[PDB]
Amino acid sequence: LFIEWL
């Protein structure tokens, strides 16, 4: 599981 916010 991977999550990124930028």
Structure solved via:
X-ray
DSSP designation for 6? -
Resolution of this structure in Å: 1.2
User: What is the end-to-end Cα distance of the chain in Å, rounded?
Assistant: 17
- C-alpha–C-alpha distance, residues 6 and 3, integer Å: 10
- C-alpha–C-alpha distance, residues 4 and 1, integer Å: 10
